[PDB]
Structures are given as structure tokens and as C-alpha cells.
Short mmCIF file of N, CA and C in Angstrom, two decimals:
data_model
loop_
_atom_site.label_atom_id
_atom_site.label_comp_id
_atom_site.label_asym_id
_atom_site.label_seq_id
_atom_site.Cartn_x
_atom_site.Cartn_y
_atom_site.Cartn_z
N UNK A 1 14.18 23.79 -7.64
CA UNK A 1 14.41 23.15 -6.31
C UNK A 1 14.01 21.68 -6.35
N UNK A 2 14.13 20.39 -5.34
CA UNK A 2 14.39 19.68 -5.10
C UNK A 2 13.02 19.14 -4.49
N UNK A 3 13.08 17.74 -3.96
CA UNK A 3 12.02 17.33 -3.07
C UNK A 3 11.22 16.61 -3.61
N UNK A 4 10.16 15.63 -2.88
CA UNK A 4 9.04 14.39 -3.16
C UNK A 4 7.89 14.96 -3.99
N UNK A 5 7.54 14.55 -4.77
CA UNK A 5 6.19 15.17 -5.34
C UNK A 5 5.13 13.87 -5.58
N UNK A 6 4.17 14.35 -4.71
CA UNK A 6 3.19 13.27 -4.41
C UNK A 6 2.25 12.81 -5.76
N UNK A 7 1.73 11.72 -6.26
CA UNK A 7 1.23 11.34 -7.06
C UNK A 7 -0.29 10.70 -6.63
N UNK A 8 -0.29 10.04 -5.64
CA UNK A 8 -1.27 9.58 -4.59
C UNK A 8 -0.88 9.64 -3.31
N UNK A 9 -1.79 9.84 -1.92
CA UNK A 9 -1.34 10.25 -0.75
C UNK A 9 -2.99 9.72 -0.15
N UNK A 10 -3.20 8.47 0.23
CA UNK A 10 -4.23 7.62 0.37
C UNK A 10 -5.11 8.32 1.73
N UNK A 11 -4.18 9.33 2.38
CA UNK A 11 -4.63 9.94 3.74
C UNK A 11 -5.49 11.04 3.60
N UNK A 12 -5.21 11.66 1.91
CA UNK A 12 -5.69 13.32 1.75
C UNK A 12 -6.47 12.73 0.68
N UNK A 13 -7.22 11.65 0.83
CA UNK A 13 -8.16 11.49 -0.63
C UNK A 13 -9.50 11.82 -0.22
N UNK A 14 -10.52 12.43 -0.46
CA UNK A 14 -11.13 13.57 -0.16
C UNK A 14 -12.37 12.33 -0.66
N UNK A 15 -13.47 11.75 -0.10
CA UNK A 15 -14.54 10.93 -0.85
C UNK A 15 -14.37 9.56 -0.90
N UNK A 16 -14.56 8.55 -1.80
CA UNK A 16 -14.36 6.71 -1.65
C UNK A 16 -12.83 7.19 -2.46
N UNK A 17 -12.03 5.85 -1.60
CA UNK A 17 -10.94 5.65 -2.27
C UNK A 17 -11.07 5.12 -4.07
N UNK A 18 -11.57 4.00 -3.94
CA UNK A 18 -11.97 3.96 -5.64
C UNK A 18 -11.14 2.57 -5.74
N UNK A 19 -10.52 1.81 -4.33
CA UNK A 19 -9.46 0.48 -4.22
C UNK A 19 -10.75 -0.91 -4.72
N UNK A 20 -9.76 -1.80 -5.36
CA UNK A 20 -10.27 -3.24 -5.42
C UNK A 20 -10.18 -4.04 -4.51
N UNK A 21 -11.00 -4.74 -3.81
CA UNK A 21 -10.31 -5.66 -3.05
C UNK A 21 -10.88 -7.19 -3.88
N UNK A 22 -10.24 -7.92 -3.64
CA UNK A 22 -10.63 -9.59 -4.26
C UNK A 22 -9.95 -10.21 -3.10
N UNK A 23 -11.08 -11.01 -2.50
CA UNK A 23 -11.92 -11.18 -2.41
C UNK A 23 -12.86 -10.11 -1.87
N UNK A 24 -14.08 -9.17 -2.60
CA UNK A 24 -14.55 -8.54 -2.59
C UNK A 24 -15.28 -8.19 -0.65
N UNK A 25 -15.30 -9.16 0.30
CA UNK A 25 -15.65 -9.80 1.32
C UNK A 25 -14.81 -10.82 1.98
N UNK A 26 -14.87 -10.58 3.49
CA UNK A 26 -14.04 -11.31 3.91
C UNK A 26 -12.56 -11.10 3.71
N UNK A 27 -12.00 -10.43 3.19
CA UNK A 27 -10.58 -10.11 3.17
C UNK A 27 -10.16 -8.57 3.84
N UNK A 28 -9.44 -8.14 2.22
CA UNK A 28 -9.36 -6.81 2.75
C UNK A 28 -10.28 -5.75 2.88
N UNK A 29 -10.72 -5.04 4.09
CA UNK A 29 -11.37 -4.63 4.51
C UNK A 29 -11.72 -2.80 5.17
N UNK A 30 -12.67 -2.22 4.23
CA UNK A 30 -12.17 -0.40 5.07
C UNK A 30 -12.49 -0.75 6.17
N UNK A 31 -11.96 -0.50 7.15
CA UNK A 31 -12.54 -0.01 8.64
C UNK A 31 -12.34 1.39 9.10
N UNK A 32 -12.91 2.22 9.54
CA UNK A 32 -12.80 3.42 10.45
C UNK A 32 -12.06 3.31 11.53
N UNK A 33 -11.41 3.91 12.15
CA UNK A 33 -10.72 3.81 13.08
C UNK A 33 -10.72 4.93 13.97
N UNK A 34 -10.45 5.00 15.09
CA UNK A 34 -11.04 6.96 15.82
C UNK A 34 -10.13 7.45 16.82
N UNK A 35 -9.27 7.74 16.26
CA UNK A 35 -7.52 8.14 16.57
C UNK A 35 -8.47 10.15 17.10
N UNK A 36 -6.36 12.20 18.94
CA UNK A 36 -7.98 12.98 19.03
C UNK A 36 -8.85 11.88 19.01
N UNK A 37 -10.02 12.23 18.33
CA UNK A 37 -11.01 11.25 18.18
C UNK A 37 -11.39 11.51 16.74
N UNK A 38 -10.98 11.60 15.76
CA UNK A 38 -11.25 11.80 14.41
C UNK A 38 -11.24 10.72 13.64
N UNK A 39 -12.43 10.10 12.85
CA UNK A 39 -12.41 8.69 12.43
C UNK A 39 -11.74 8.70 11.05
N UNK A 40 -10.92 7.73 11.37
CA UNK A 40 -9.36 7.52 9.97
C UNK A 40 -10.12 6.07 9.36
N UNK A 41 -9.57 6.35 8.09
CA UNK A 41 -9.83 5.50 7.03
C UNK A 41 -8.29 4.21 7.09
N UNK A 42 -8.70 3.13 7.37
CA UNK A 42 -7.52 1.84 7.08
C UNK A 42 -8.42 1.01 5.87
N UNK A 43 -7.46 -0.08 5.60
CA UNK A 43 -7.72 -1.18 5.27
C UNK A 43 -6.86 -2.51 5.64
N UNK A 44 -7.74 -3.13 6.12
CA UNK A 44 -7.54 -4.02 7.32
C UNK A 44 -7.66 -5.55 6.39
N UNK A 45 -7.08 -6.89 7.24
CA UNK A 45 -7.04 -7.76 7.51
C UNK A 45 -6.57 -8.72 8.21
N UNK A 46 -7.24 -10.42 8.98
CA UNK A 46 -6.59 -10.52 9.77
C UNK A 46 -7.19 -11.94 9.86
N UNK A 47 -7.39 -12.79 9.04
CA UNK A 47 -7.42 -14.71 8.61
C UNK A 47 -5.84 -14.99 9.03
N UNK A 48 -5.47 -14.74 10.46
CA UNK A 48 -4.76 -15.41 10.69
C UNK A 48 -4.22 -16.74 10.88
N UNK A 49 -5.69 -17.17 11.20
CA UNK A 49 -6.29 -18.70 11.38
C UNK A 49 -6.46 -19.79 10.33
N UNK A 50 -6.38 -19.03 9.12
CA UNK A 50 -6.97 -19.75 8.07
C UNK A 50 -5.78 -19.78 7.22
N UNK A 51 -6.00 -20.88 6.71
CA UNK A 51 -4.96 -21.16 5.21
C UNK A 51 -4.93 -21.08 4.33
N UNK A 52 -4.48 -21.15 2.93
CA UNK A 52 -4.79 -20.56 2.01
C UNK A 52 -5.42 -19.47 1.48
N UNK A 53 -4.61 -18.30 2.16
CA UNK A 53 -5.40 -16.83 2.13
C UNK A 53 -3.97 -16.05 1.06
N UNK A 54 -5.53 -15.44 0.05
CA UNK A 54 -4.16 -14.89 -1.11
C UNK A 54 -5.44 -13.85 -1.19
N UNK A 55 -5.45 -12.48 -0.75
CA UNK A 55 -6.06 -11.66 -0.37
C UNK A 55 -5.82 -10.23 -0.72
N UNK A 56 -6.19 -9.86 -2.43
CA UNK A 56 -5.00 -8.94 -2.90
C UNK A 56 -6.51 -7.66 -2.88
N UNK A 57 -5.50 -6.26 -2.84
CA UNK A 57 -6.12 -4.99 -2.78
C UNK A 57 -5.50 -4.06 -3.55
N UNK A 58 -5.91 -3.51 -4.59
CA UNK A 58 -5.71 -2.61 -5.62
C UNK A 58 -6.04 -1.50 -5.80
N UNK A 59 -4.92 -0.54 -5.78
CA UNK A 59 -5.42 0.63 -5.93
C UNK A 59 -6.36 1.06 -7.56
N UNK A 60 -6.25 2.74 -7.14
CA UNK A 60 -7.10 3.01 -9.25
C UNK A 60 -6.13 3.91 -9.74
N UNK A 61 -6.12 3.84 -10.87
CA UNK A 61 -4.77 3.89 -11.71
C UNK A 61 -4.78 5.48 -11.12
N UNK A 62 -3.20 5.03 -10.78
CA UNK A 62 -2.26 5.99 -10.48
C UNK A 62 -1.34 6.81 -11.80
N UNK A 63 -1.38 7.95 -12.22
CA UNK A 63 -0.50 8.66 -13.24
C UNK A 63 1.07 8.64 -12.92
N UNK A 64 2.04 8.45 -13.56
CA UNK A 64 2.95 8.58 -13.51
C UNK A 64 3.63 9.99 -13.33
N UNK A 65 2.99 10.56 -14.28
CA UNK A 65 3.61 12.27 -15.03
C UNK A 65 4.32 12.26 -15.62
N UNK A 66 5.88 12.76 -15.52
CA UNK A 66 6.67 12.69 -16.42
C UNK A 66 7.82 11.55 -15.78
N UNK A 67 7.60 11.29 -14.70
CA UNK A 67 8.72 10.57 -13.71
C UNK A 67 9.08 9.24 -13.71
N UNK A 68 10.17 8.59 -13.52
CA UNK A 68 10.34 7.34 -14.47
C UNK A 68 10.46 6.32 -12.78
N UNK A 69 11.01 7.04 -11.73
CA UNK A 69 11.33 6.19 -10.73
C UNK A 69 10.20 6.71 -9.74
N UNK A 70 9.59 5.85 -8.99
CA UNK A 70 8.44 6.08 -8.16
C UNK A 70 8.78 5.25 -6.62
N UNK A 71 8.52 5.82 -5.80
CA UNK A 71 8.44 5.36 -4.56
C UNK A 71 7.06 5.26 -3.79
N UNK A 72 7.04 4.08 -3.18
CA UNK A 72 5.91 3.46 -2.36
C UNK A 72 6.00 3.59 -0.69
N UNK A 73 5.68 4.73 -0.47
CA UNK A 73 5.65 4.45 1.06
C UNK A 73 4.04 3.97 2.01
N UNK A 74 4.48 2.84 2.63
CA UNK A 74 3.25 2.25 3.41
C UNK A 74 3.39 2.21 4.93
N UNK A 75 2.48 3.07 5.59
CA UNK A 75 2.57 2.96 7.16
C UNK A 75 1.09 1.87 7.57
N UNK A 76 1.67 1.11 8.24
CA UNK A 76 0.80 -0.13 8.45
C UNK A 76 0.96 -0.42 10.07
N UNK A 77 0.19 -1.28 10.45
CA UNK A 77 0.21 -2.37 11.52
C UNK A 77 0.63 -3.35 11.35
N UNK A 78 1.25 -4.05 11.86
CA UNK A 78 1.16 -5.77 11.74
C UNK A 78 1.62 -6.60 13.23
N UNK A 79 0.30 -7.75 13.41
CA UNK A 79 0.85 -8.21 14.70
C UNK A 79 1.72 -9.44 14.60
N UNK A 80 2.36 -9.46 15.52
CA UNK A 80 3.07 -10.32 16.21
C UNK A 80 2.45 -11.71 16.38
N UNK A 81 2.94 -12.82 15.15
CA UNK A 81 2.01 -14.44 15.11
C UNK A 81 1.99 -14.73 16.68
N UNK A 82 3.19 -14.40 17.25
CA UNK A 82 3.52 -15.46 18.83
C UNK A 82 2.35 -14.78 19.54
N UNK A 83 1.74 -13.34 19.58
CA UNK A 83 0.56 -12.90 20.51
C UNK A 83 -0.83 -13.10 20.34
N UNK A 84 -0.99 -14.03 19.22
CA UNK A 84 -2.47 -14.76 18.57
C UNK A 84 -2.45 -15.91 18.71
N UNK A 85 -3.73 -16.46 19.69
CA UNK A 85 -3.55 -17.67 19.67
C UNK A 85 -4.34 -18.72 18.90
N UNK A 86 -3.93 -19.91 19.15
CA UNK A 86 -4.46 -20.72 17.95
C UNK A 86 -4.19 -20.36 16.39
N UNK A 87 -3.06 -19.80 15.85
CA UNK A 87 -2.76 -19.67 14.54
C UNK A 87 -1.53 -19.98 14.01
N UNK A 88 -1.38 -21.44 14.86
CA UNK A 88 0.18 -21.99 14.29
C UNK A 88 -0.07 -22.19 13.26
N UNK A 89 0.96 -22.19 12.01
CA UNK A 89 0.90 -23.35 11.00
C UNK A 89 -0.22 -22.29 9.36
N UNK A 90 -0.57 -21.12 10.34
CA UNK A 90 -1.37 -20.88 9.25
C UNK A 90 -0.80 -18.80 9.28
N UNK A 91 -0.36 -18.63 10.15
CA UNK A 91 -0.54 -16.97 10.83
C UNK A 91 1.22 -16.92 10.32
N UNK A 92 1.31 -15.37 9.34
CA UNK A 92 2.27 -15.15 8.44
C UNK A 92 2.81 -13.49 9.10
N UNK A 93 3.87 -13.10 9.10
CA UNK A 93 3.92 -11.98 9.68
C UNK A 93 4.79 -10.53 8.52
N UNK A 94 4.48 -10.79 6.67
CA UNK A 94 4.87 -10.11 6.09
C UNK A 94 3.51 -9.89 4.96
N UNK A 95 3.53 -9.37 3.70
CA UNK A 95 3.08 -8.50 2.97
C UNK A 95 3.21 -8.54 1.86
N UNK A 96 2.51 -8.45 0.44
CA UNK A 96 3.59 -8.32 -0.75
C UNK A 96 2.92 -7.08 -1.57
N UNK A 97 3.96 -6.30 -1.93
CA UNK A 97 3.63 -5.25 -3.43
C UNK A 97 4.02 -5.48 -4.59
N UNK A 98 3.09 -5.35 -4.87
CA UNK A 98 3.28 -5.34 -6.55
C UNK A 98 2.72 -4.21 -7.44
N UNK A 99 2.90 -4.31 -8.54
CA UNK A 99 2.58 -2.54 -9.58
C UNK A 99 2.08 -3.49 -11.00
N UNK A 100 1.91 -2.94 -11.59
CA UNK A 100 0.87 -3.01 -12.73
C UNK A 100 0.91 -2.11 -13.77
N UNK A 101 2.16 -1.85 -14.53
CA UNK A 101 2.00 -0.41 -15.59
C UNK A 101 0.56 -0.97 -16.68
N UNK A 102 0.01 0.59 -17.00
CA UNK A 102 -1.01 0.84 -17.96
C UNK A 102 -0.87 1.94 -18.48
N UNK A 103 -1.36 2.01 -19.76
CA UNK A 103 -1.77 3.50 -20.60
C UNK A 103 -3.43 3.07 -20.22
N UNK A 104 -3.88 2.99 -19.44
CA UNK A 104 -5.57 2.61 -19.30
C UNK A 104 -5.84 2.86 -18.03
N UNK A 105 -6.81 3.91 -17.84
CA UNK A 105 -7.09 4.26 -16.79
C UNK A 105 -8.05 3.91 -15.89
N UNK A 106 -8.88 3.18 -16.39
CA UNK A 106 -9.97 2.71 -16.16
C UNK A 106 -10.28 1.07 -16.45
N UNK A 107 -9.07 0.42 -16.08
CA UNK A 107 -9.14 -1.05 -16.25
C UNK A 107 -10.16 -1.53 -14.92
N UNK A 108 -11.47 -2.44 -15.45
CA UNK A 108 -11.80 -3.51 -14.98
C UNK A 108 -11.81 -4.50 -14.62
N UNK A 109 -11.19 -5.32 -14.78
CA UNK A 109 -11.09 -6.75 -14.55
C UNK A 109 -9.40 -7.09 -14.52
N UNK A 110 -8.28 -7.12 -13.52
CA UNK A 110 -7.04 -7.18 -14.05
C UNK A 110 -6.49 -8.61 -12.84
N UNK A 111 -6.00 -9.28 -14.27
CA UNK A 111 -5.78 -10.79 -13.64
C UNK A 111 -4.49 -10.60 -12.73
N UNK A 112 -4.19 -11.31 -11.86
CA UNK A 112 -3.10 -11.87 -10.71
C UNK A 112 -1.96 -11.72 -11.50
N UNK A 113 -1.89 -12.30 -12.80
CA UNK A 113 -0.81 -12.72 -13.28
C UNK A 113 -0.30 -11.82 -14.11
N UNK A 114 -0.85 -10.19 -14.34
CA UNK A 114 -0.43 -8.88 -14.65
C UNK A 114 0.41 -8.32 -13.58
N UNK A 115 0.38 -8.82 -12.52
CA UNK A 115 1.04 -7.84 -11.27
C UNK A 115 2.77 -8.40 -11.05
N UNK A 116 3.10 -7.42 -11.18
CA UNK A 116 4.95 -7.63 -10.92
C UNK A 116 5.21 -7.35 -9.51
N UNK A 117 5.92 -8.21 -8.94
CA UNK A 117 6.16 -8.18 -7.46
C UNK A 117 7.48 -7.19 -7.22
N UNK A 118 7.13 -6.06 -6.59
CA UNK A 118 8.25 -5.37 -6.12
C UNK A 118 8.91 -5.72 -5.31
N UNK A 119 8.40 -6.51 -3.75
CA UNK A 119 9.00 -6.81 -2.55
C UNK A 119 8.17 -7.51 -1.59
N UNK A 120 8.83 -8.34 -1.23
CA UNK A 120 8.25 -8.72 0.53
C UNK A 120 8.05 -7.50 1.76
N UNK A 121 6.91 -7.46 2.44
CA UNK A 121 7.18 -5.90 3.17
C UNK A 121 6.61 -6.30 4.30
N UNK A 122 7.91 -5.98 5.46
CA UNK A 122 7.99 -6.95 6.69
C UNK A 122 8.16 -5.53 7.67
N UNK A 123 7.44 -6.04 9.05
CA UNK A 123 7.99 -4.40 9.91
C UNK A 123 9.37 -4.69 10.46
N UNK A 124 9.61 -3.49 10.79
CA UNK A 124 11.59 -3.45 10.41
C UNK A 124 11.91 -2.11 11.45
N UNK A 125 12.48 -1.77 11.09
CA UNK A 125 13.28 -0.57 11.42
C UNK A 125 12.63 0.58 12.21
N UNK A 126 11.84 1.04 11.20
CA UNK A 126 11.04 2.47 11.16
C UNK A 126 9.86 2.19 11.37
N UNK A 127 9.23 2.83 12.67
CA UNK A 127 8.14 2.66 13.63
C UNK A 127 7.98 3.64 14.38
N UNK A 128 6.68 4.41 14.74
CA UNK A 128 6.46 5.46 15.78
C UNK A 128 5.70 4.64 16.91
N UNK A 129 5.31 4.68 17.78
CA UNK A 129 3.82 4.52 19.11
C UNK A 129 3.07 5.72 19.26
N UNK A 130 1.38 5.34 18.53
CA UNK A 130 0.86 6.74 18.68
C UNK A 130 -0.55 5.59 18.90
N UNK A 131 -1.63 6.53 18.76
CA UNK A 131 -3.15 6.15 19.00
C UNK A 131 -3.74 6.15 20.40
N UNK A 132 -7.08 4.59 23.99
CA UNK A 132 -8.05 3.51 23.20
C UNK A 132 -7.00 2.25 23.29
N UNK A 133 -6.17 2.08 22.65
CA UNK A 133 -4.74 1.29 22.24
C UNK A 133 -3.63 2.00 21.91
N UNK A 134 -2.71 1.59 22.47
CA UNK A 134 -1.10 2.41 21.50
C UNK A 134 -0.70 1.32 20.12
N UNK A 135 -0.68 1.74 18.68
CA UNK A 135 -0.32 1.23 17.89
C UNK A 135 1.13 1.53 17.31
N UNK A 136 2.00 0.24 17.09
CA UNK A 136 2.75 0.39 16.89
C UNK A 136 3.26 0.46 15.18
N UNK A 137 2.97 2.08 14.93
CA UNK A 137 2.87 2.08 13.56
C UNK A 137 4.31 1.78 12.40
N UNK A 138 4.40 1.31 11.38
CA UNK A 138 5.65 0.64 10.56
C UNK A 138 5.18 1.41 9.15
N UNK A 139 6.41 2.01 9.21
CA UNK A 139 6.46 2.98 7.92
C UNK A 139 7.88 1.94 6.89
N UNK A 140 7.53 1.84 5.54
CA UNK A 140 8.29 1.15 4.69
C UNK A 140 7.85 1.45 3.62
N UNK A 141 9.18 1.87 2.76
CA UNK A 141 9.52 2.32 1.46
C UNK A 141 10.23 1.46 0.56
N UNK A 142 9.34 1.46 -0.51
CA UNK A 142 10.21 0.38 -1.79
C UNK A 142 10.01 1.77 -2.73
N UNK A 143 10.78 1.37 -3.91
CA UNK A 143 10.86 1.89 -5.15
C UNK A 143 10.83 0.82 -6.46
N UNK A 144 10.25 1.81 -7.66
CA UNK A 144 10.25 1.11 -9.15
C UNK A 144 10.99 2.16 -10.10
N UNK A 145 11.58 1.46 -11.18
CA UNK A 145 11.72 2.24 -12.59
C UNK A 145 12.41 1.39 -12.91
N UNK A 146 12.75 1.85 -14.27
CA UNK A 146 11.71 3.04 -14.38
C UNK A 146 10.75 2.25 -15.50
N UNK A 147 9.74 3.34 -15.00
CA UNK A 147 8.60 3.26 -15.37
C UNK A 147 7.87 3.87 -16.91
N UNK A 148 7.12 3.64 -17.95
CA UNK A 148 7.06 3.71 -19.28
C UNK A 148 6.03 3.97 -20.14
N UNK A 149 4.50 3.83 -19.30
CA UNK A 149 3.51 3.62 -19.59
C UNK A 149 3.00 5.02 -19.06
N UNK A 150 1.52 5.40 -19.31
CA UNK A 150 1.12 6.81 -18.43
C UNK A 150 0.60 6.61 -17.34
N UNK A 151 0.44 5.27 -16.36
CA UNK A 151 0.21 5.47 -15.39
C UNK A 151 0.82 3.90 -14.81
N UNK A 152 -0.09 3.42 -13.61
CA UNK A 152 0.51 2.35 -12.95
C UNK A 152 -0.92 2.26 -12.09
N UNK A 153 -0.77 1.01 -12.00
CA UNK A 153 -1.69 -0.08 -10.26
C UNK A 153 -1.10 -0.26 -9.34
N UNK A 154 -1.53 -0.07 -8.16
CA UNK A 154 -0.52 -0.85 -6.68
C UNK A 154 -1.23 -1.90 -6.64
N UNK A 155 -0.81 -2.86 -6.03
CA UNK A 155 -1.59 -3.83 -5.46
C UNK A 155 -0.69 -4.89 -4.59
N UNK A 156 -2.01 -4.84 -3.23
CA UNK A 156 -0.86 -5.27 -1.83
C UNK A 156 -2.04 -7.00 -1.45
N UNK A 157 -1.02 -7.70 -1.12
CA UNK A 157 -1.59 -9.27 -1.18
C UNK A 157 -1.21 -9.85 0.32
N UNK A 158 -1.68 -9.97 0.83
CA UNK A 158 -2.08 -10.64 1.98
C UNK A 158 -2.39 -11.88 2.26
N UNK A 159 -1.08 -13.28 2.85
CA UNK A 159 -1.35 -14.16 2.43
C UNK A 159 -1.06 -14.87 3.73
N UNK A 160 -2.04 -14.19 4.76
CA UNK A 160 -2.19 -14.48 6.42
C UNK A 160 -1.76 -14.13 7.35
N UNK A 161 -1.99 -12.65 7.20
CA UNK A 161 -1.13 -11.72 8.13
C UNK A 161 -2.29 -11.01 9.15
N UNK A 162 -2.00 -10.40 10.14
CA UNK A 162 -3.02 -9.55 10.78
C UNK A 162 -2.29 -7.92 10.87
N UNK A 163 -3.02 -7.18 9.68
CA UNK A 163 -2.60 -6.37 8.98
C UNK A 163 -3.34 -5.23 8.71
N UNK A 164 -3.49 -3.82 9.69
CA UNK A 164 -3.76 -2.66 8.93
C UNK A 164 -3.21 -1.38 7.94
N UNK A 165 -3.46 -1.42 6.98
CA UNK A 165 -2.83 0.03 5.99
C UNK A 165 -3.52 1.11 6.79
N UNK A 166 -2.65 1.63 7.09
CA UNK A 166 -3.02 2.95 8.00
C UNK A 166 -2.61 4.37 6.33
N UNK A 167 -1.64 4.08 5.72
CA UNK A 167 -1.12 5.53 4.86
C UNK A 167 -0.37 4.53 3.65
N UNK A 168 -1.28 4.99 2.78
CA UNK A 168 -0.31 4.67 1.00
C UNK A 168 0.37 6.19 0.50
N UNK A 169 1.29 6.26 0.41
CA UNK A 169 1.59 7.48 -0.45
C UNK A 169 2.55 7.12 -1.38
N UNK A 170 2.49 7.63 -2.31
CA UNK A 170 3.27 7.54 -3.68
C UNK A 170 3.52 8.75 -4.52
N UNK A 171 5.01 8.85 -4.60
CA UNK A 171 6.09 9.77 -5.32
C UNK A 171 6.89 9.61 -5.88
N UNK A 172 7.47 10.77 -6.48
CA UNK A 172 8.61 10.64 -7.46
C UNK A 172 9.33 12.10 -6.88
N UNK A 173 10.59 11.85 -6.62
CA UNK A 173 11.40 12.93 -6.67
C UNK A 173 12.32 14.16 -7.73
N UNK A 174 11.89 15.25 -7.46
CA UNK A 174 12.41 15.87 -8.56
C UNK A 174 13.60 16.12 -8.25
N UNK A 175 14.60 16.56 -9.04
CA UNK A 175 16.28 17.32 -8.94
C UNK A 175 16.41 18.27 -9.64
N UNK A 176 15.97 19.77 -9.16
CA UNK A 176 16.07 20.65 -9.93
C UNK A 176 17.04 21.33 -9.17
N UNK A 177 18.23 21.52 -9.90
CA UNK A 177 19.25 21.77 -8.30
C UNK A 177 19.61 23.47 -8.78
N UNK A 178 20.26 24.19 -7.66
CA UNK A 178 19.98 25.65 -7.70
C UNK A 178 21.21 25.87 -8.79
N UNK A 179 21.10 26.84 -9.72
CA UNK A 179 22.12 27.75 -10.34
C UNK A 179 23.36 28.50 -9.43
N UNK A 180 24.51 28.28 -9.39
CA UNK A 180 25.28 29.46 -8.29
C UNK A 180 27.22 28.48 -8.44
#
């Protein structure tokens, strides 16, 4: 049979995520959040004000398996520059992903200039209203392949947005189609 098979699912991770952020402070940021009233895990930012903000967050190596094409789905926040004030000239209203293949699972130190840019990731289309506040949540899907190595890095860069990751999940679809 057929269907998504999850590889990471940032919502069902059970303990610390295990993410990089650089700048370690001041950027990207966990916050709790208390949606019912059950406190949810984001990662937040929001130097709308400020300039020169290159504000990247990395996941920990993700396995591939056997699957060559992978999909990135991210449900986020993002506000609206025109409803913040005082952040002409500096307040950005998109996102960037990028991936990182490795056979190394346990990389330390991984420079800027390892990361391949998949896409600009702007809110669009696909959006629910749920949540105190109603948030207007933005679900967006990119894809890679294929892919070659035994695993992979995400990593999402923030370069003056006011911006929560509410859900990372990452898959690969199988096609095992029926006999008949």
C-alpha cells in the first residue's frame, strides 16, 4: 500500500528537540505556548526592527532510509510587516530552507556555506484559524531529491521576519500499489 511515511514529526518528539540555533540567544527561540490549555512547543522569532538579522535554526540529523525524494512540511505563523509598527525598512515577511546531506550523524560545528537552499517560504494559500488569540496558522510544503547520503540537516534562516514554527514534519512517500 501507499502513503507518507514520517521520518521526523517535530510535534511527537517525546523530550529536548536536540535543534541548533545560531545565534545561540536572541534569535531563534523555544517558547511554550498554551493552546485546550496544553503547553505546545514553537520556535519563535521576531527582530523585526533590526537589520541585519541572518538567524538560522537546525535541526539533528535526520535519516533518510531508503527514500530518495523527501518532503518538508512547515506549519508556522507569520505577521503581517504593515501591523508592526516602527519596522519600515528593516521587517521582512518570508523564510528560507535549506538541507544539508551527511553520512554523519552527529555533526558539530556545520558552516552556513554547507546549506543548499531549497526555497523562499512565504504564507500563501493553505491556512487554518485555531488557538487567548486566534492564530492564523500557514502550512507549506517543499520537496528534495533525490537524496544520496544516509541522512540530511534542515535548517530554517530568518532574515527579519516575525515568525513562529508551530510543526516540522518530514517524509517520504511510498508506492506500493495493490496486485489485481
Amino acid at each position: 500500500e501507499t502513503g507518507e511515511v514520517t521520518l521526523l514529526d517535530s510535534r511527537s518528539v517525546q523530550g529536548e528537540l536536540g535543534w541548533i540555533a545560531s545565534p545561540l540567544e536572541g534569535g531563534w527561540e523555544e517558547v511554550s505556548i498554551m493552546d485546550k490549555n496544553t503547553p505546545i512547543r514553537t520556535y519563535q522569532v521576531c527582530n523585526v526592527m533590526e537589520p541585519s538579522q541572518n538567524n538560522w535554526l537546525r535541526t539533528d540529523w535526520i535519516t533518510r532510509e531508503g527514500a530518495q525524494r523527501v518532503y518538508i512540511e512547515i506549519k508556522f505563523t507569520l505577521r503581517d510587516c504593515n501591523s508592526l509598527p516602527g519596522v519600515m525598512g528593516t521587517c521582512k515577511e518570508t523564510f528560507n530552507l535549506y538541507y544539508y546531506e551527511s553520512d554523519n550523524d552527529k555533526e558539530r560545528f556545520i558552516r552556513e556555506n554547507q546549506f543548499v537552499k531549497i526555497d523562499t517560504i512565504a504564507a500563501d494559500e493553505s491556512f487554518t484559524q485555531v488557538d487567548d488569540r486566534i492564530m492564523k496558522l500557514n502550512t507549506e510544503i517543499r520537496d528534495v531529491g533525490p537524496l544520496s547520503k544516509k541522512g540530511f540537516y534542515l535548517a530554517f534562516q530568518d532574515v527579519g521576519a516575525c515568525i513562529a514554527l508551530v510543526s516540522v514534519r518530514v517524509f517520504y512517500k511510498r508506492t506500493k500499489h495493490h496486485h489485481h
